[PDB]
């Protein structure tokens with residue numbers, strides 16, 4: 046099989062330097078362009094998505110939309126899941142990134158940003174950056190919705206959708222496109238490449254450049270992953 | 281139950297004077313401005329789509345993606361079916377509307393455009409504007425795929441989707457938005473409103489404006505449809 | 515592609531000599547056995563269903579359940595649909611066929627029973643043998659549901675499910691088993707082979723014997739349909 | 750949200766003294782009798798499932814098929830998953846329970862049968878009792894398909910299907926009937942009522958008796974669960 050991952054580009058809150066996580070923030074004007082370049086890179090580099098999987102965060106959805114518009118496969122099937130969602134930022138959701146570096150001091154800030162398993166404190170159900178009871182998460186077990194998270198966790202929850210849902214399509218021969226977020230794609234790629242806990246910290250999945258994994262029946266790489274634009278992914 | 285219909289705005293061929301039908305033509309910059317204006321009226325008028333049904337045509341899918349972006353409901357689930365497609369135009373696909381008028385005359389021209397039962401002529405199997413074999417219709421019975429169509433025919437193939445798929449949702453208390461084409465929606469409004477086989481021709485659906493139908497437990501209008509902007513609709 | 519068709523054995527009404535149509539009548543002792551016979555024949559001639567389709571009438575559901583148990587293939591995906599139902603018998607629903615022969619006369623009995631396009635009168639909504647408002651049809655447009663039908667009418671509604679739903683599986687390489695009823699299965703074989711309206715009345719499809727169809731890209735049959743027991747079939 | 754749980758009865762193997770686990774052993778005469786009694790009990794107590802969930806093991810699919818044939822709800826939708834399956838018994842599958850005891854001993858046997866987190870040894874794919882590669886699991890990530898299991902692990906693979914799939918229907922408003930096994934249902938019940946890591950062994954789920962739950966908006970019990978036969982249960 047063939048799989049193509051795509052991280053949205055800059056978002057409205059990303060240029061204001063605010064932590065996003067699950068707040069359904071829009072895709073910046075720049076993020077719509079990096080979207081189109083991914084589309085164009087799909088068309089150009091001849092990767093052809095038979096089905097699409099996004100998260101339930103609009104910045105991700107808007108990316109696939111614009112990208113598929115440019116590759117002319119706007120008509121392919123569409124599934125969404127909270128399991129493809131970005132990591133939840135807890136208390137840190139909607140807090141100024143730089144204003145938070147000063148309150149926590151470089152070490153606590155960084156463990157929260159790039160550690161595999163330490164989550165920011167949970168958010169209040171009353172917060173304005175809380176999704177407790179959001180309409181797009183109304184048919185999911187209220188008990189499983191996080192109020193914070195870490196890479197570790199994000200993966201504990203993404204895996205089951207990958208195992209059952211996104212895998213039928215792959216083993217069905219189909220070519221799957223996933224348009225999700227930064228933490229969730231690094232999380233998928235870790236499961237995929239076998240990277241250690243210690244190691245996943247060093248992986249950057251460059252925004253707007255689709256990454257193609259050609260997999261075998263056991264859903265493990267055939268050959269090593271290729272970005273559709275090398276020098277761009279490496280620069 | 282609440283239903284919302286959205287006719288996609290202009291396309292690249294609406295500018296060129298070319299009969300489109302099923303050719304997968306794109307929204308023009310103007311079409312996009314229209315799609316957006318529709319999503320805004322959904323937002324502003326507090327009409328909240330729980331689910332989405334488009335056609336397999338991009339210009340329709342583009343309209344959905346733009347409109348629900350301005351409505352912030354870009355997350356609602358979405359299903360697609362060739363049965364929401366616009367009327368297949370047969371031979372007349374990939375051709376000039378003005379040249380077609382200089383050829384067949386006013387009468388045969390109107391007939392190809394607005395007759396209920398009279399379909400344009402069948403398109404040659406191996407033509408540059410035929411969708412026979414399109415990747416997007418590869419899991420449908422090959423024999424049911426139209427070489428041409430008439431509003432009559434269009435409705436014969438739309439009704440079943442409405443009856444089993446769109447209704448499952450409407451009857452689950454969901455608000456369904458449909459984004460399709462002029463004739464497929466012409467088709468469905470006829471069915472919903474009991475409009476005559478003679479009177480359907482005179483109905484047009486303003487592009488970029490959401491027709492909201494407030495249906496009862498028998499999927500029949502409990503009161504007349506209202507566009508979320510009836511003045512720009514006059 | 516390959517399609518298996520299974521007509522069910524007698525119901526508890528085909529036994530007391532009654533018209534059933536849409537009455538959710540239970541399969542009879544003689545017919546549950548024909549269901550089992552059906553099962554061993556799928557296993558015997560190595561015909562392997564990867565997905566099952568039935569209708570909403572309990573006599574057809576029961577037949578496949580009892581049959582895939584014998585084929586050792588219980589586990590497969592299952593789809594049920596009113597469109598695969600048996601022809602709605604209208605006013606004849608729940609009436610002794612012999613009393614019905616004298617209540618009408620041979621010509622009007624032959625019509626109501628074997629014509630292609632003249633449906634029996636409609637059954638009143640109040641009548642105890644009406645399915646109007648019955649729960650299993652609650653998510654279907656109230657107006658499409660028949661009050662009486664003809665073989666023609668049955669093909670009209672059968673076809674859309676076959677064209678959109680069944681074809682998708684077939685065209686994806688799956689061997690589809692359909693367990694339903696007489697007219698609906700005949701309505702379907704009329705399509706598959708271009709049988710004329712004039713001749714359709716002649717076609718029988720025995721109960722408890724699987725009609726397999728080897729199809730091609732065009733879902734038109736590749737070679738003559740065959741029963742996995744041509745004797746008890748041609749007998 | 751109303752949920753109904755149905756454990757299946759004695760399989761062919763529960764009489765021959767062998768560990769079954771993931772082996773698709775068919776139900777026997779009494780197994781097929783108790784299922785019909787579960788069905789009669791449902792009709793009687795007026796519990797009408799709106800949709801069905803079963804594992805991918807014949808014994809429980811049969812129970813549902815027999816139980817719902819007896820309830821008159823033969824027609825309700827049917828969904829299936831390997832996550833609803835019975836606990837994998839790894840290298841104890843296909844083996845006799847008494848001879849197992851002669852190899853491991855009281856302690857190590859009581860542990861492989863009743864510890865919450867110690868799985869029996871794994872089984873080599875080569876064995877005629879390993880489901881690795883079985884057709885019914887060809888559309889699930891191969892890597893996740895257990896070659897042994899513990900109740901802890903059963904809950905871990907199960908929860909996500911409950912969370913996303915079972916709950917959608919329960920939250921949609923429907924009455925859900927699950928028909929799985931001892932482990933998966935006890936594993937579910939542990940979660941539903943908060944039964945502790947070291948207290949769950951004591952919980953018996955009678956076979957053939959339907960267990961009903963009445964859940965609130967949080968899919969947490971609204972009242973204490975109840976069997977449609979409080980006599981045959983204890």
Ligand SMILES: O=C(O)c1c(C(=O)O)c(C(=O)O)c(C(=O)O)c(C(=O)O)c1C(=O)O
Nearest residue numbers: 294298299300301367393394462463483484
């Ligand atoms: O999509 C078309 O080409 C079309 C249009 C159009 O220009 O959007 C119109 C129109 O004038 O609005 C009509 C019409 O007569 O209302 C038709 C019509 O013939 O159905 C079409 C068309 O070609 O289907």
